[PDB]
Amino acid sequence: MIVPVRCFTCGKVLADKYYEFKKRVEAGEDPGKVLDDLGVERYCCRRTLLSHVELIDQVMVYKVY
């Protein structure tokens, strides 16, 4: 439900640049160029960043205590 800290393949950290990538994608920018500008070269890290779906906000609304 939250972005993984590291890439599942090579362990490259991607969670720091995920929110900027999501913000730039929603602004109409090309996701490939945004990934290229963020240093995401290998397509495994691109797989991790592109295929992630954020769902933690939909879980926080239900309280468990």
Partner 1 sequence: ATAVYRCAKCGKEVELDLATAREVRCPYCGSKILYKPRPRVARRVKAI
For Zn ion, the binding residues (CB under 5 A) are 7, 9-10, 12, 42, 44-45
The reply to whether 65 sits near partner 1 by the rule CB under 8 A is yes
Sign of CA dihedral 52, 22, 18, 62: negative
Residue 28: beta bridge partners?
A: none
The reply to whether 60 sits near partner 1 by the rule CB under 8 A is no
- Contacts of residue 34, Cβ cutoff 8 Å, sequence gap at least 6: 21, 24, 25
The listed partner (partner 1, Zn ion, none) that binds 44, CB under 5 to 8 Å by sort, is Zn ion
Feature table: binding site for Zn(2+): 7, 10, 44-45
